[model samples]
Target: MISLADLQRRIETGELSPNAAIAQSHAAIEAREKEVHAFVRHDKSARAQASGPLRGIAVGIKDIIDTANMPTEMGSEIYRGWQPRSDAPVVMMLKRAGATIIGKTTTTAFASRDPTATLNPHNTGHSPGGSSSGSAAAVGAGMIPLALGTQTGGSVIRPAAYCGTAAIKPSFRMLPTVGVKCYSWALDTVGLFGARAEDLARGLLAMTGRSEFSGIVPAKAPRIGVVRQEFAGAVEPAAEQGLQAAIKAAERAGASVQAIDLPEAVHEAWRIHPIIQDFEAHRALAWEFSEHHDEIAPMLRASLDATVGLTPKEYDEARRIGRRGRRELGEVFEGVDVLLTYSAPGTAPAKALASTGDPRYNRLWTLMGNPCVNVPVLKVGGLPIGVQVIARFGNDAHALATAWFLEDALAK
Candidate 1:
């Protein structure tokens, strides 16, 4: 895997042409996309801006995000061939950085579990965890160095882990979700995926106009915490072994790893997540469900039906619980730079379209609105299981830097 930082360096030295670099990525897309099913549509003719910070970088935007030139299908049939008249803010930001807009990666229907055709690069028989299936698969398959994704639950991190790709779901609203279909405004977050955490950092710095992560390691090792009860143990034994092995490896590599039980309030907040997400999603997707309910996928239809049972008072209570969980996150972070946990219940599920795998391990952290990065360093039965390196809300750069360190350490 190549880093965007190195790619940009080569471009800066006149060692590579931006157009050629982008074409190489397109070539990769053409090569593996048929098997991986990473993109719904791509414009090989798309070119990067002549000059900018992210020149030579090829990025795949998730289909749910708007691009005036491409269809923003949201992986739903109702919006098939639908084109937006404007770019989403993040798309605009990538353009400003001179990134070549490769194409729209596949999304689960409305970024939920009505899975797309995307298949995992590791093993075609395993499902690429959605709803950010194509973004993660695209990067994992080496079709592109950078891709955009979103996470209402485990969409970004789950796929990153399942596909063995490096990715980050930044603090909520860290990247604008404007101009994208809103599944749940309160939980929806824009995310990034790349070959490695440093690559993610490089793209993030350029795209967001920030400069914290430039391939720099921390002055000291991070004080790491672990959760091994219901959350981490929910995974299959292989996944649990992988998580334990990763923590051990980190400790051997100089990280201070320790067991930290989640507070009762935070643990209970997991149940409340679906409450708020369902409540908000009903309103966000109101237009379709109200007008053409049967036109949408059956999974979404069933999900929306359940959300109708959620009362306004219940939603409000869940929101309050989320607030309480956020307030307690600081206490959990005391003396710890980050916590290491399982990214998904397990690695990619078998190649079945019926389910996209569980997001139970991801919901509370997403609800807390903290930054989470999936570090692809664990392997079980030749398939990869990712460990999530997470941090306090808004400290996105630190979480990324720590993840970068782990990514490199594990590679060694």
Candidate 2:
């Protein structure tokens, strides 16, 4: 994959124009779109913005997000052909940054249990994890330098792991969720995707208008906490051994690594994350569920039906557990700057599998509202194995730095 950072650097030197970059992105998409099925629809008519921080950068928006130029289908028949009157706040931000809108990528129905047809760019036979499936695949195949995705659960990180793209599910609320379709209001978050961690950092800083994170790369070896859960051993040997080697590689790079057990409270928080998500989802789509319930996928229908009986008190208790986990997380990071965990249970599964993959390792980090970056530096049998570096809430730059450091280390 080509690095988005490289493209930006070249543009600054007058070696490339925004038009040329946009053209290159379209060319890439033309070569692979039909094979990868990465997008529900792509705009070959895109015009490049000649000025702004992100000029010439191409971004893929998930179909679930609002885009005025295209219909926001949300991967279901209910909203089919529904044209949005405006772009999502995040999309408007990208346009203002001078980025090119490449196309709308495929998503799971309402970013839920159902998987999309987007093929893993690395292996067409394997699945590219759900929800953000098309966003990750488009970036993975170099069709775009940057993209927008949302993660209520593991939509961003899991797909990034499967497609071997560098991505960030930033601290919740780091980016606006105002115009995007919601799965869980408290958990739904906008995320970034790029060819590598360095590109993600550059794109993120530009989108959020944050300069502090711009120069942030490990100035010194960081203190890292390696989180181990009971399910740690449940991961396949390839994933487990690859993660251990990554930790060793980081230590060799001068990082201090410490093995730590995840707290019971955090574990409980993960268990109940679905509770809050489903509760909010049922409400967010309440009108649609009542008006066009049959139009949605049956699996989603059953899941929503299951949530119908949840009491408000159950949701409040889950929120309390979530809050406690967030407050207690300081202790989890007391001796380290960030925590590392397996991005997924293993590599991406085959297309025939009923499920995309497990998010057990990802849900807690999402619940705690911590900044997470998936580093796709490991592979077994030619398939990508991603490991995530998580930082304390709101400390995004350092978490990115650590992931970038590890990614660079692995490359070396």
Candidate 3:
């Protein structure tokens, strides 16, 4: 995986051309997209813009994000032909940074639990996770170096973990959500995917123009809190082994690693996540499903039926739980700069195509609107696995910094 800086240098030095880079990415996509099912729509015109900063970079946009003149299906058949008149803010930001939008990636129905056609590139027989499944898989498969995704309830991190790629879910609202299909406003966050941590960092800086990261000095031997017990007991042995290996690697690289107690709020947050997602999704997709039921998948239509009757009190309670959980998690962070855990409950589950893997490992952090990263650090049978690193809200720069340190340490 090449870093963005290296690519940029190559482009500037005439060592490589943007058009050639995009062409190569497209060829890779053509070769692997059928088996991976990582894209909903691939843009053939992407190479037309051959002089932008990301001129040659091919980026996959999650279907939830609106792209002008391109289909934004929201992963639901109800809006199969839907096309927005303009790009979402995040898309615009990427465009402004000179990124070439290569395609719209697959997503879960209404960005919900109903799985799409995407499969993990590491093992075609396992779930890549969703609703950011395509974004993670495309990067992991080496079709593109970067892509855009979102997380409402582990959409970004879980897939990144399952697909064995690097991804960053920034603090809630860190990137504008307008023009993007959403489930829960409280939990939805914009994120990006890449093969390397530095590439993600550069993309974030380019999009947000946050200079605090400019000329950033990498921290040596950062302190990392290892949550060995909380929710970890639910993970499979392979995931546990991968996480333990990551911890040991970090410790060896000079990080001070210590076990920490699980915050009680995390458990509460986990319980309320589904409620909030289900209730809000019902409301958000009411127009299409209620009026055009035939267009949606059976599973999603059924989920809507089940959630449409949730009482207002239930919705309110879920929001209240989310708020309290954030506060409690905030308190936990007061004692540690960053928290580390498995990005997913287990390695990607054997593919059934009937479902994506569970998002349990990432729900608490997403519910809290904290920034998090999926750091690819281990491999099982040549398939990559990731560890999740989280930081307090509005600490995206810090989170990226910590991710860089961990990547550097583990690589050694």
Candidate 4:
């Protein structure tokens, strides 16, 4: 797979034209999209129009994000043919960066718990984590070098990890969330998927106008804090093995890796995450459920029905707990430059079409509003395993720099 930097360099040197690059991406999509089921809609014309730094770059937008002319179905029949009149802020940013919107990728129903049509490109029988399943899978399959995703739970990190790609779920509010269908306001954060850390970083910088550090600046070996105890109780053996391998790889590359116990509050934060997500999601989707209930998928309808049982007082408490969790995690980052943990419990579950794998391991970081990355470095029984790396809130550049270091370390 081509790195975004390589693509950009080629474009800058006139070795590659925007149209040709886009056409190559389209050809890739045509060849593999059937098995992956990554996109809800495809637009070759949009690729033809691509011009700029990202002009030839192909991107798969999460279906929940508004794409003006493309259908924003939210991976449910409810809005299957719905098209927005204006692009979401992120979509507009990609366009400005010269990225061609290859298509709107699939999502879980309302970006909720329901499984999407997307399958993991790494192993078709295994599930691709969601609700960013399609975006991650599309990039992993080499259909595009970059794609957009979002996280309310494990949507971005988990999917990207499972699909063997690079991804970053930036701190909450680091990137504008407007124009993306809301899942849970408190937990929702924009994210992206790509083949390499630099690609993901460049795409994010281009979109947010964050200044780029000199690529030639040798990345310092990050002081990584390893969270092992949490995994001992929360993860399966394969997941733990993968985490250990990743840590050893980092150490071999000269990183100072040390074990650190996570704060006790993180456990409580995990419990409170679903409460906050479910409560806020109910409110966000109330209009659709009330007026367009029949249009929603059956699984989503059931989920909404269950959420309706949550009392307002419960919802309030969940929000309060979420805030407390954020504060607790803030304190945890005081010493370490970054925290390294298992991206998920294990390799992608050997189930496709029926469900997306568990995301319990990822919920806390999402709730903490910290920037996180899924570094795909291990393969267990042919399925991809990812190590999740996180940095303090609003420190995305630092987080990304650390990720770049780790990615290179693992590749060696």
lDDT of 3 by residue, 1-412 (tens): 4356667678879898888877888898988998999999998777625566676777899999999968898888667799899999999888887878899999988887787878888889888888888998898888887899999888999898888788999988988999889787877888999876678887887788888646554557777888754643567777889888888888998889888876776777778888888887777776876788777777777878777788789889988978988888888877788888888776777777467777778877887888899888887876667898888898877787888888887888
Please list all clashing residue pairs in model 4, or write none if there are none.
Answer: 54-98
Give the Å shift of residue 32 in candidate 3: 1.9
- For residues 61-121, could you state the per-residue lDDT of candidate 2 as single tens digits? 9999999998899998888898999999899889998998878999989988787888999
If ranked by lDDT, best first, what sequence of candidates would result? 2, 1, 4, 3
Reference-based lDDT, each prediction: 0.86, 0.87, 0.82, 0.83
Question: What's the TM for model 4?
Answer: 0.95
- List residue ranges in candidate 2 displaced over 4 A: 231-233
lDDT (0-100) at residue 288 of candidate 4? Answer: 90
| lDDT top scorer | 2
Tens-place lDDT per residue, model 1, 4-43, is 8789889999999998889888899999999999999988
Q: What are the clashing pairs of model 2?
A: none
User: In terms of lDDT, which candidate is stronger, 2 or 3?
Assistant: 2
Please give the range of 10 consecutive residues that has the lowest summed lDDT in model 3: 212-221
> Which tens-of-lDDT digit does each residue in 46-153 have in candidate 4?
754445668888889999999888889888777868888999999999889778888989889888777876788988888888889889889888898899999988
Candidate 3 residue 349 C-alpha distance from true site, Å: 1.4
TM for every model, in the order presented, reads: 0.97, 0.97, 0.94, 0.95
**Clash totals, every prediction:** 0, 0, 1, 1
